[PDB]
Short mmCIF file of all heavy atoms in Angstrom, two decimals:
data_model
loop_
_atom_site.label_atom_id
_atom_site.label_comp_id
_atom_site.label_asym_id
_atom_site.label_seq_id
_atom_site.Cartn_x
_atom_site.Cartn_y
_atom_site.Cartn_z
N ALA A 1 12.41 -1.86 -0.27
CA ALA A 1 11.99 -0.69 -1.06
C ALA A 1 10.52 -0.92 -1.42
O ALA A 1 9.64 -0.01 -1.27
CB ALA A 1 12.73 -0.47 -2.27
N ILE A 2 10.18 -2.06 -1.87
CA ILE A 2 8.77 -2.38 -2.21
C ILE A 2 7.87 -2.17 -0.95
O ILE A 2 6.80 -1.66 -1.01
CB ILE A 2 8.57 -3.81 -2.74
CG1 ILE A 2 9.23 -3.90 -4.22
CG2 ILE A 2 7.17 -4.19 -2.83
CD1 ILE A 2 9.47 -5.36 -4.55
N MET A 3 8.37 -2.77 0.12
CA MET A 3 7.63 -2.55 1.40
C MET A 3 7.48 -1.06 1.70
O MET A 3 6.27 -0.62 2.10
CB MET A 3 8.27 -3.33 2.55
CG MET A 3 7.71 -4.71 2.90
SD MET A 3 8.50 -5.49 4.33
CE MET A 3 9.93 -6.11 3.48
N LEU A 4 8.56 -0.30 1.72
CA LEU A 4 8.50 0.99 2.22
C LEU A 4 7.68 1.98 1.40
O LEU A 4 7.00 2.82 2.04
CB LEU A 4 9.96 1.52 2.34
CG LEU A 4 10.26 2.99 2.73
CD1 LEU A 4 9.52 3.16 4.12
CD2 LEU A 4 11.71 3.27 2.79
N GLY A 5 7.79 1.96 0.08
CA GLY A 5 6.96 2.82 -0.66
C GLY A 5 5.38 2.66 -0.52
O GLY A 5 4.80 3.64 -0.30
N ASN A 6 5.01 1.36 -0.44
CA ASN A 6 3.64 1.20 -0.20
C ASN A 6 3.25 1.48 1.22
O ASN A 6 1.97 1.81 1.53
CB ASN A 6 3.26 -0.38 -0.73
CG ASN A 6 3.46 -0.54 -2.14
OD1 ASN A 6 2.77 0.01 -2.95
ND2 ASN A 6 4.52 -1.32 -2.43
N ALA A 7 4.16 1.16 2.17
CA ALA A 7 3.83 1.56 3.54
C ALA A 7 3.64 3.04 3.63
O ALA A 7 2.77 3.60 4.40
CB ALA A 7 5.01 1.02 4.47
N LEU A 8 4.47 3.86 2.99
CA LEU A 8 4.24 5.31 2.92
C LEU A 8 2.97 5.70 2.41
O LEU A 8 2.25 6.58 2.82
CB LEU A 8 5.38 6.00 2.18
CG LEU A 8 6.77 5.99 2.87
CD1 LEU A 8 7.68 6.93 2.16
CD2 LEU A 8 6.75 6.41 4.39
N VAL A 9 2.53 4.98 1.29
CA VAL A 9 1.24 5.28 0.64
C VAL A 9 0.20 4.97 1.61
O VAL A 9 -0.83 5.81 1.84
CB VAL A 9 1.02 4.55 -0.71
CG1 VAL A 9 -0.31 4.69 -1.22
CG2 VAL A 9 2.12 4.98 -1.71
N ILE A 10 0.10 3.85 2.31
CA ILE A 10 -0.82 3.46 3.13
C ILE A 10 -0.87 4.42 4.43
O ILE A 10 -2.01 4.84 4.90
CB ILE A 10 -0.67 1.96 3.59
CG1 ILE A 10 -0.74 1.07 2.43
CG2 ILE A 10 -1.69 1.71 4.76
CD1 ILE A 10 -0.20 -0.25 2.79
N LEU A 11 0.27 4.80 4.84
CA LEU A 11 0.35 5.79 6.00
C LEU A 11 -0.30 7.14 5.58
O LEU A 11 -1.02 7.71 6.37
CB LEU A 11 1.87 6.04 6.33
CG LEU A 11 2.04 7.13 7.43
CD1 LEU A 11 1.36 6.79 8.80
CD2 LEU A 11 3.61 7.23 7.61
N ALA A 12 -0.01 7.62 4.36
CA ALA A 12 -0.63 8.81 3.93
C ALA A 12 -2.14 8.69 3.91
O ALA A 12 -2.85 9.56 4.38
CB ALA A 12 -0.10 9.19 2.51
N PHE A 13 -2.63 7.58 3.33
CA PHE A 13 -4.07 7.38 3.19
C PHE A 13 -4.75 7.39 4.62
O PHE A 13 -5.73 8.05 4.89
CB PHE A 13 -4.44 6.11 2.58
CG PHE A 13 -5.89 5.85 2.43
CD1 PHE A 13 -6.68 6.23 1.50
CD2 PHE A 13 -6.54 5.10 3.47
CE1 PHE A 13 -8.00 5.97 1.38
CE2 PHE A 13 -7.81 4.88 3.52
CZ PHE A 13 -8.60 5.28 2.41
N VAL A 14 -4.04 6.66 5.54
CA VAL A 14 -4.64 6.54 7.00
C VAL A 14 -4.59 7.88 7.62
O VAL A 14 -5.46 8.23 8.46
CB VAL A 14 -3.91 5.50 7.67
CG1 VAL A 14 -4.21 5.52 9.15
CG2 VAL A 14 -4.27 4.10 7.10
N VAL A 15 -3.47 8.62 7.54
CA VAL A 15 -3.28 9.86 8.31
C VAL A 15 -4.05 11.08 7.79
O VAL A 15 -4.67 11.75 8.59
CB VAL A 15 -1.65 10.11 8.42
CG1 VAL A 15 -1.45 11.42 8.93
CG2 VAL A 15 -1.09 9.10 9.26
N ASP A 16 -3.90 11.25 6.47
CA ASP A 16 -4.43 12.62 5.91
C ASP A 16 -5.98 12.74 6.22
O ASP A 16 -6.36 13.75 6.83
CB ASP A 16 -4.18 12.65 4.48
CG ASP A 16 -3.78 14.08 3.98
OD1 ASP A 16 -3.54 14.93 4.91
OD2 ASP A 16 -3.64 14.32 2.81
N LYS A 17 -6.73 11.81 5.91
CA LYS A 17 -8.21 11.80 5.99
C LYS A 17 -8.72 12.78 4.92
O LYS A 17 -10.07 12.87 4.85
CB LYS A 17 -8.70 12.12 7.34
CG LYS A 17 -8.34 11.18 8.46
CD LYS A 17 -9.31 11.11 9.46
CE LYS A 17 -8.96 9.92 10.45
NZ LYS A 17 -10.08 9.78 11.55
N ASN A 18 -8.06 13.55 4.15
CA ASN A 18 -8.45 14.28 3.05
C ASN A 18 -8.22 13.46 1.76
O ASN A 18 -8.42 14.01 0.69
CB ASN A 18 -7.68 15.69 2.90
CG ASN A 18 -7.61 16.37 4.21
OD1 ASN A 18 -8.67 16.74 4.73
ND2 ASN A 18 -6.46 16.54 4.72
N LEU A 19 -7.97 12.13 1.88
CA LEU A 19 -7.75 11.31 0.72
C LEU A 19 -8.87 10.24 0.64
O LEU A 19 -8.62 9.05 0.50
CB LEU A 19 -6.31 10.63 0.88
CG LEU A 19 -5.24 11.57 0.93
CD1 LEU A 19 -3.91 10.74 1.13
CD2 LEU A 19 -5.19 12.40 -0.29
N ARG A 20 -10.17 10.59 0.78
CA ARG A 20 -11.24 9.70 0.73
C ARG A 20 -12.07 9.85 -0.56
O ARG A 20 -13.21 9.67 -0.53
CB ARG A 20 -12.16 9.93 2.00
CG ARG A 20 -11.57 9.76 3.32
CD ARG A 20 -11.21 8.36 3.64
NE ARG A 20 -10.32 8.12 4.79
CZ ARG A 20 -9.02 8.49 4.74
NH1 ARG A 20 -8.43 8.97 3.65
NH2 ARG A 20 -8.21 8.29 5.83
N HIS A 21 -11.29 10.13 -1.59
CA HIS A 21 -11.82 9.99 -3.00
C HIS A 21 -11.70 8.73 -3.55
O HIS A 21 -10.98 7.80 -3.08
CB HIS A 21 -11.22 11.14 -3.83
CG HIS A 21 -11.78 11.25 -5.18
ND1 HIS A 21 -11.18 11.28 -6.36
CD2 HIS A 21 -13.20 11.51 -5.50
CE1 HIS A 21 -12.00 11.51 -7.30
NE2 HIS A 21 -13.16 11.63 -6.86
N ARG A 22 -12.37 8.34 -4.61
CA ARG A 22 -12.27 7.08 -5.28
C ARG A 22 -10.92 6.68 -5.70
O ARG A 22 -10.49 5.57 -5.44
CB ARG A 22 -13.29 7.01 -6.49
CG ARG A 22 -14.69 7.52 -6.11
CD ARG A 22 -15.52 7.59 -7.44
NE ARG A 22 -15.65 6.23 -8.15
CZ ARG A 22 -16.38 6.06 -9.32
NH1 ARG A 22 -16.95 7.05 -9.90
NH2 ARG A 22 -16.42 4.83 -9.83
N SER A 23 -10.23 7.63 -6.37
CA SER A 23 -8.79 7.52 -6.74
C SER A 23 -7.93 7.08 -5.56
O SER A 23 -7.07 6.26 -5.57
CB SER A 23 -8.30 8.78 -7.47
OG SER A 23 -7.76 9.62 -6.47
N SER A 24 -8.12 7.75 -4.45
CA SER A 24 -7.38 7.46 -3.22
C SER A 24 -7.67 6.03 -2.70
O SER A 24 -6.66 5.32 -2.31
CB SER A 24 -7.70 8.50 -2.02
OG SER A 24 -7.31 9.74 -2.49
N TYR A 25 -8.87 5.57 -2.71
CA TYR A 25 -9.23 4.14 -2.33
C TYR A 25 -8.59 3.20 -3.26
O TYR A 25 -8.02 2.16 -2.85
CB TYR A 25 -10.66 3.99 -2.22
CG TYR A 25 -11.30 4.59 -0.97
CD1 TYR A 25 -12.05 5.75 -1.06
CD2 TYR A 25 -11.25 3.80 0.23
CE1 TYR A 25 -12.53 6.31 0.09
CE2 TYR A 25 -11.87 4.32 1.32
CZ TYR A 25 -12.51 5.60 1.27
OH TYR A 25 -13.12 6.04 2.40
N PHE A 26 -8.58 3.46 -4.57
CA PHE A 26 -7.91 2.48 -5.51
C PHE A 26 -6.46 2.46 -5.31
O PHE A 26 -5.75 1.48 -5.39
CB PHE A 26 -8.31 2.96 -6.93
CG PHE A 26 -9.78 2.97 -7.22
CD1 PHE A 26 -10.28 3.78 -8.25
CD2 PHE A 26 -10.64 2.33 -6.40
CE1 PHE A 26 -11.66 3.72 -8.54
CE2 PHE A 26 -12.03 2.32 -6.62
CZ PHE A 26 -12.48 3.02 -7.58
N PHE A 27 -5.79 3.65 -5.10
CA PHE A 27 -4.39 3.67 -4.74
C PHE A 27 -4.05 2.98 -3.48
O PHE A 27 -3.09 2.22 -3.38
CB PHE A 27 -3.94 5.23 -4.58
CG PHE A 27 -3.90 5.92 -5.88
CD1 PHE A 27 -3.63 7.31 -5.82
CD2 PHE A 27 -4.15 5.34 -7.10
CE1 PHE A 27 -3.52 8.07 -7.03
CE2 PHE A 27 -4.14 6.04 -8.18
CZ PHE A 27 -3.86 7.46 -8.15
N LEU A 28 -4.91 2.96 -2.43
CA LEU A 28 -4.80 2.32 -1.25
C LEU A 28 -4.80 0.79 -1.56
O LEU A 28 -4.03 0.01 -0.97
CB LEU A 28 -5.76 2.65 -0.18
CG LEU A 28 -5.82 1.80 1.03
CD1 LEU A 28 -4.83 2.18 2.06
CD2 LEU A 28 -7.28 1.87 1.73
N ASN A 29 -5.74 0.34 -2.42
CA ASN A 29 -5.76 -1.11 -2.80
C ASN A 29 -4.50 -1.49 -3.42
O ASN A 29 -3.94 -2.55 -3.18
CB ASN A 29 -6.97 -1.38 -3.64
CG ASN A 29 -7.64 -2.65 -3.33
OD1 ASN A 29 -7.79 -3.02 -2.17
ND2 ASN A 29 -8.28 -3.30 -4.35
N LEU A 30 -3.97 -0.70 -4.44
CA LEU A 30 -2.83 -1.10 -5.17
C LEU A 30 -1.62 -1.08 -4.23
O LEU A 30 -0.76 -1.99 -4.31
CB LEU A 30 -2.58 -0.04 -6.29
CG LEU A 30 -1.27 -0.14 -7.12
CD1 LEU A 30 -1.21 -1.25 -7.97
CD2 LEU A 30 -1.12 1.15 -7.85
N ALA A 31 -1.54 -0.14 -3.30
CA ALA A 31 -0.42 -0.10 -2.30
C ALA A 31 -0.58 -1.31 -1.36
O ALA A 31 0.59 -1.81 -1.14
CB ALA A 31 -0.54 1.26 -1.47
N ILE A 32 -1.65 -1.72 -0.97
CA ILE A 32 -1.75 -2.92 -0.08
C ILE A 32 -1.23 -4.15 -0.91
O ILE A 32 -0.41 -4.89 -0.30
CB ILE A 32 -3.23 -3.15 0.32
CG1 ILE A 32 -3.65 -2.10 1.42
CG2 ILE A 32 -3.32 -4.56 0.92
CD1 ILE A 32 -5.07 -1.88 1.38
N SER A 33 -1.57 -4.27 -2.05
CA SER A 33 -1.13 -5.46 -2.95
C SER A 33 0.28 -5.37 -3.12
O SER A 33 0.92 -6.45 -2.95
CB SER A 33 -1.82 -5.41 -4.32
OG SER A 33 -1.87 -4.09 -4.86
N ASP A 34 0.95 -4.30 -3.44
CA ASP A 34 2.30 -4.19 -3.68
C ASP A 34 3.08 -4.41 -2.36
O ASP A 34 4.14 -4.98 -2.25
CB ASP A 34 2.67 -2.95 -4.38
CG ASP A 34 1.96 -2.69 -5.69
OD1 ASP A 34 2.04 -3.68 -6.52
OD2 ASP A 34 1.41 -1.66 -5.94
N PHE A 35 2.59 -3.80 -1.30
CA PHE A 35 3.16 -4.03 -0.01
C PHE A 35 3.34 -5.40 0.43
O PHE A 35 4.35 -5.90 0.89
CB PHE A 35 2.48 -3.17 1.06
CG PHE A 35 2.95 -3.42 2.44
CD1 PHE A 35 4.02 -2.81 2.94
CD2 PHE A 35 2.22 -4.24 3.35
CE1 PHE A 35 4.58 -3.06 4.23
CE2 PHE A 35 2.64 -4.38 4.71
CZ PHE A 35 3.77 -3.81 5.08
N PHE A 36 2.18 -6.19 0.23
CA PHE A 36 2.21 -7.62 0.66
C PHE A 36 3.00 -8.42 -0.46
O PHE A 36 3.44 -9.63 -0.06
CB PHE A 36 0.81 -8.15 0.87
CG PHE A 36 0.33 -7.85 2.21
CD1 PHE A 36 -0.79 -6.99 2.46
CD2 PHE A 36 0.91 -8.52 3.32
CE1 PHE A 36 -1.20 -6.76 3.72
CE2 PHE A 36 0.33 -8.30 4.63
CZ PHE A 36 -0.65 -7.41 4.81
N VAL A 37 3.13 -7.92 -1.65
CA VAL A 37 4.13 -8.53 -2.42
C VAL A 37 5.56 -8.42 -1.79
O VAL A 37 6.38 -9.37 -1.74
CB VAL A 37 4.11 -7.93 -3.86
CG1 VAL A 37 5.37 -8.28 -4.59
CG2 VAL A 37 2.94 -8.28 -4.58
N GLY A 38 5.89 -7.20 -1.28
CA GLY A 38 7.16 -6.94 -0.71
C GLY A 38 7.37 -7.76 0.54
O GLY A 38 8.49 -8.25 0.85
N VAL A 39 6.29 -8.02 1.30
CA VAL A 39 6.45 -8.50 2.70
C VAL A 39 6.53 -10.03 2.63
O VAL A 39 7.21 -10.72 3.42
CB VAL A 39 5.26 -8.10 3.59
CG1 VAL A 39 5.54 -8.81 4.98
CG2 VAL A 39 5.13 -6.66 3.72
N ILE A 40 5.89 -10.70 1.73
CA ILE A 40 5.61 -12.18 1.73
C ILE A 40 6.40 -12.95 0.62
O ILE A 40 7.25 -13.83 0.95
CB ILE A 40 4.13 -12.59 1.63
CG1 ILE A 40 3.40 -11.97 2.89
CG2 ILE A 40 4.02 -14.09 1.82
CD1 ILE A 40 1.92 -12.13 2.87
N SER A 41 6.26 -12.39 -0.63
CA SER A 41 6.64 -13.23 -1.68
C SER A 41 8.21 -13.15 -1.68
O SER A 41 8.93 -14.21 -1.63
CB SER A 41 6.15 -12.63 -3.07
OG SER A 41 4.69 -12.38 -2.89
N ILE A 42 8.84 -11.97 -1.88
CA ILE A 42 10.25 -11.91 -2.07
C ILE A 42 11.02 -12.47 -0.89
O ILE A 42 11.99 -13.20 -1.01
CB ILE A 42 10.64 -10.33 -2.37
CG1 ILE A 42 9.75 -9.89 -3.53
CG2 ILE A 42 12.15 -10.37 -2.77
CD1 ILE A 42 10.15 -8.42 -3.98
N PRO A 43 10.73 -12.06 0.32
CA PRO A 43 11.45 -12.65 1.41
C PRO A 43 11.45 -14.07 1.46
O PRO A 43 12.45 -14.81 1.95
CB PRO A 43 10.79 -12.03 2.75
CG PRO A 43 10.00 -10.67 2.14
CD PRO A 43 9.65 -11.27 0.81
N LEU A 44 10.26 -14.72 1.17
CA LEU A 44 10.29 -16.24 1.10
C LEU A 44 11.10 -16.73 -0.10
O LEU A 44 11.66 -17.81 -0.01
CB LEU A 44 8.87 -16.78 1.05
CG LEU A 44 8.09 -17.02 2.27
CD1 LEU A 44 6.67 -16.89 2.15
CD2 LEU A 44 8.48 -18.39 2.78
N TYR A 45 11.30 -15.88 -1.18
CA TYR A 45 11.97 -16.36 -2.27
C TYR A 45 13.46 -16.51 -2.02
O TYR A 45 14.13 -17.42 -2.49
CB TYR A 45 11.72 -15.27 -3.44
CG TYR A 45 12.17 -15.82 -4.84
CD1 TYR A 45 11.57 -16.91 -5.35
CD2 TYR A 45 13.09 -15.14 -5.52
CE1 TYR A 45 11.97 -17.34 -6.60
CE2 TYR A 45 13.51 -15.58 -6.82
CZ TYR A 45 12.97 -16.76 -7.29
OH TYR A 45 13.45 -17.16 -8.52
N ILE A 46 13.98 -15.53 -1.29
CA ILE A 46 15.49 -15.45 -0.99
C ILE A 46 16.00 -16.80 -0.52
O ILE A 46 16.91 -17.35 -1.16
CB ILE A 46 15.91 -14.24 -0.26
CG1 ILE A 46 15.14 -12.91 -0.79
CG2 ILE A 46 17.36 -14.04 -0.35
CD1 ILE A 46 15.69 -11.77 -0.26
N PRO A 47 15.56 -17.28 0.62
CA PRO A 47 16.16 -18.54 1.12
C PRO A 47 15.92 -19.78 0.09
O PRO A 47 16.78 -20.71 0.00
CB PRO A 47 15.59 -18.81 2.45
CG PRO A 47 14.80 -17.41 2.79
CD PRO A 47 14.52 -16.94 1.44
#
């Protein structure tokens, strides 16, 4: 879920191109951070 929500946010930013405001860039940064939390930290945690 952590991966998917932030992946959707990043996809929206990349695709729309009407999201080039400052708030959109900050949201992209936050989405990248949370996405890579989902991809690296938790999956390594489980085993």
Side-chain angles (χ1 to χ4, degrees):
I2 289 164
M3 259 181 285
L4 178 53
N6 295 292
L8 288 194
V9 173
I10 299 163
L11 173 62
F13 178 91
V14 167
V15 164
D16 220 7
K17 301 210 171 182
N18 314 296
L19 301 177
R20 301 291 168 286
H21 190 229
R22 308 171 63 177
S23 84
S24 297
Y25 281 100
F26 304 159
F27 289 175
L28 173 82
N29 222 33
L30 173 74
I32 291 156
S33 46
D34 303 311
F35 172 78
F36 274 112
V37 166
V39 183
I40 302 174
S41 317
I42 310 188
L44 269 155
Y45 193 61
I46 312 193

